Amino acid sequence: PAYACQRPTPLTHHNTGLSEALEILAEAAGFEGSEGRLLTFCRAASVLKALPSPVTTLSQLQGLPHFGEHSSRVVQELLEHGVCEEVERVRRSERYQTMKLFTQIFGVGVKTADRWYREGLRTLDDLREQPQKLTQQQKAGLQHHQDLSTPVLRSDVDALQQVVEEAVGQALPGATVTLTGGFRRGKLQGHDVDFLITHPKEGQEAGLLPRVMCRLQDQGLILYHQHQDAFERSFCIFRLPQPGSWKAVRVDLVVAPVSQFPFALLGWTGSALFARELRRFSRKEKGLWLNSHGLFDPEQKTFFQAASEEDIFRHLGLEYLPPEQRNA
DNA sequence: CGGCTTACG
DNA sequence: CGTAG
DNA sequence: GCCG
Ligand SMILES: Nc1nc2c(ncn2[C@H]2C[C@H](O)[C@@H](COP(=O)(O)OP(=O)(O)OP(=O)(O)O)O2)c(=O)[nH]1
Ligand SMILES: [Mg+2]
Ligand SMILES: [Mg+2]
Ligand SMILES: [Mg+2]
Ligand code: NA
Numbered sequence: 001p002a003y004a005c006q007r008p009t010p011l012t013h014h015n016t017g018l019s020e021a022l023e024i025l026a027e028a029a030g031f032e033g034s035e036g037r038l039l040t041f042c043r044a045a046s047v048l049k050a051l052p053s054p055v056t057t058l059s060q061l062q063g064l065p066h067f068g069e070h071s072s073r074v075v076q077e078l079l080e081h082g083v084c085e086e087v088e089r090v091r092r093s094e095r096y097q098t099m100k101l102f103t104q105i106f107g108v109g110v111k112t113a114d115r116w117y118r119e120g121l122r123t124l125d126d127l128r129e130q131p132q133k134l135t136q137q138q139k140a141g142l143q144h145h146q147d148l149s150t151p152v153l154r155s156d157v158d159a160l161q162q163v164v165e166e167a168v169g170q171a172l173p174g175a176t177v178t179l180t181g182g183f184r185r186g187k188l189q190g191h192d193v194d195f196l197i198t199h200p201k202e203g204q205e206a207g208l209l210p211r212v213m214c215r216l217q218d219q220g221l222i223l224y225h226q227h228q229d230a231f232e233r234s235f236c237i238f239r240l241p242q243p244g245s246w247k248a249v250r251v252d253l254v255v256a257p258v259s260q261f262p263f264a265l266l267g268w269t270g271s272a273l274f275a276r277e278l279r280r281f282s283r284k285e286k287g288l289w290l291n292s293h294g295l296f297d298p299e300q301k302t303f304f305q306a307a308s309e310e311d312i313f314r315h316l317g318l319e320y321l322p323p324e325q326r327n328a
Numbered sequence: 329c330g331g332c333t334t335a336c337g
Numbered sequence: 338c339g340t341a342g
Numbered sequence: 343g344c345c346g
Contacts, residue, residue, distance in 0.1 A: 002345080027342065029343085039332055040343035068344055103342060111338070137339070191342085226337060226340095233336060235340050252340080254336095267334085272341075276333060284331090291334055 002065040003285075004043065005278040005318060007050045008325035011186050015048035015055055018075055021087045022048070025074065028090045031099040031110060042273055044071040046328045055079070098122050106141030106148060106237070106250060140224040144237055147248035151189035156240055160193055160251065163221060164212075168197055171211035175199040180268040181252070186324040192250035196268055198261045209234055209255045223248050232256075260293050262306040267292030274328035282316055290316075 001007050013019070026041035043066040048055065058076050061067045067075075077084040090096050095117065101124065102113035121127060127134065127142055134142065141148070157179065165177045178184075181194025197212070199205045209232055216222050216238075225236035232255045240249040256264035267275050282290040288304075289296040295304040295315060306312050313320045 023342095025343095030342075034343085036332055037343050040345090043344085066344060070343060100342075107339065109339060109341065135339085231337065233340080235337080279333065280331095283333095293335080 003277050003281045004046050004050075004274055004328035005281050005321070005326075008321055009046060009050045009274070009328045010325060011327045013049045013051070014053050015051055018055060018078055019045040019048045021074060021078055021084055022071060024087050024090055027100070028096050031096060031103075031114070033110070033114075040066055041071065043277075046273060049327065094122070102127075104149065105138065105145060106235075107135060107137035108141065112138075137224075137226070140237060144223065144248040148191070148237070148250055150247065152191070152193060152249055154183060154188050156249065157183050157193050160238065160240060160249070161195070163219070164195055164216070164251075164253070167212050167215040167219070168208075171215055172199060172204065172208050174201070175205065175208060178265065180254075180265060181270060184269050184323045185271065185327050192252055194252045194268055195254070196261070196264055197253060197255045198258050198264075200258055202257055202259055205255050205257050209253060212253065256292075259305070262309050262312055263290075263294050264292045266309050266312055269323050269326065271326055271328050274326040277328060278316075281318075286316055288316070 022041050022045035026038045026045065029037035029041060047064055047066055055061065055075065056079065058072065058079065061072050061075060074084045074086065098117055099110070099113050102108050102116055103110055116127070121130070124142065124145060131139065161177060161179060168175050168177055176198055178196045179194070180196045181192070182190045183193065197205070197208065199208070207230060210227065210230065213222065213225055213227060213234055213236070217228060221239050222228065223237040223239050225234055227234070234253045236251055236253070238249045238251045239246050254264060254268055266278070279290045282288045282295070287299065289298060295306070295312060297304070304315050306315070310320050
């Protein structure tokens with residue numbers, strides 16, 4: 001099938017080298033603002049992740065969605081020579097290396113990275129020499145860059161979840177914390193930890209996240225957050241115990257009312273490409289508008305109610321995929 | 329040819 | 338603009 | 343870059 005949400009995609013697969021090459025090209029297309037090319041290379045990489053066995057000859061690409069002349073030539077060169085000249089040229093290019101370095105910073109996206117590149121900046125130390133060019137968010141991302149470039153381990157996640165649950169429980173008894181994002185999909189490491197918070201009584205979650213953040217702040221556990229008036233998402237930097245020391249870790253906290261929790265869980269569990277393809281499928285194939293708050297029928301002007309992710313897959317006519325099979 | 333993403337901070 | 342490579 |  002053509003859409004990633006129509007097929008299981010496990011975390012580990014049989015075409016790792018091929019998919020990683022196409023994702024280099026996708027990433028480079030994004031750095032140049034070519035959103036269409038980025039999508040195609042991302043989708044072509046995701047198709048290979050979903051295959052049941054390694055691709056060893058060009059003929060196996062026949063009939064595969066999102067493989068045309070360019071992606072097929074990349075695979076053919078990898079199969080024949082072990083390396084694709086285009087991919088290698090991208091890897092060592094000054095533009096790709098710098099855009100990757102700059103966009104990796106918390107608070108810096110492609111547009112900011114590109115402007116800094118055009119102004120001649122190239123290294124983290126170049127940015128540090130120009131603090132007037134930085135927001136407070138970017139200052140935090142720059143100062144914590146080394147820790148934030150170290151993968152968070154699954155062992156780290158359980159201790160973090162306990163401390164978030166502690167603060168959430170004092171902010172609002174009965175509220176729950178659910179691990180989302182890549183760790184819910186089975187990843188053993190990540191760039192951050194993602195949590196979704198709710199409460200079983202609709203409406204009781206209103207105003208919760210400011211109360212949670214203030215309690216974590218008082219514990220000395222928040223190295224950075226955007227409110228250090230009402231908000232429901234926080235993208236922060238946590239202080240996480242280490243042996244004889246501590247390390248900075250990115251943590252995302254999202255609050256949703258229980259009526260919307262299945263949609264938020266589906267959206268924030270990802271993968272980013274999985275969720276993007278699920279929304280594209282919903283709109284284009286089923287005529288329904290999906291987001292992290294609900295699922296809208298624009299003809300009937302009605303929202304579907306969902307009590308589970310299983311509800312939503314059924315509403316969309318899709319076979320259910322557990323989180324470990326959404327690694328598109 | 330047009331289409332290819334969201335809400336919230 | 339950033340969360341968001 | 344690929345699809346419909
Ligand atoms: N619309 C949109 N949502 C995004 C994007 N990047 C992340 N998200 C949202 C939706 C994803 O399901 C959710 C989780 O993605 P994360 O950035 O936390 O990454 P993930 O946990 O998949 O892996 P990682 O943290 O890198 O180990 O965040 C993006 O580029 N666009
Ligand atoms: Mg994550
Ligand atoms: Mg995250
Ligand atoms: Mg962006
Ligand atoms: Na960034």
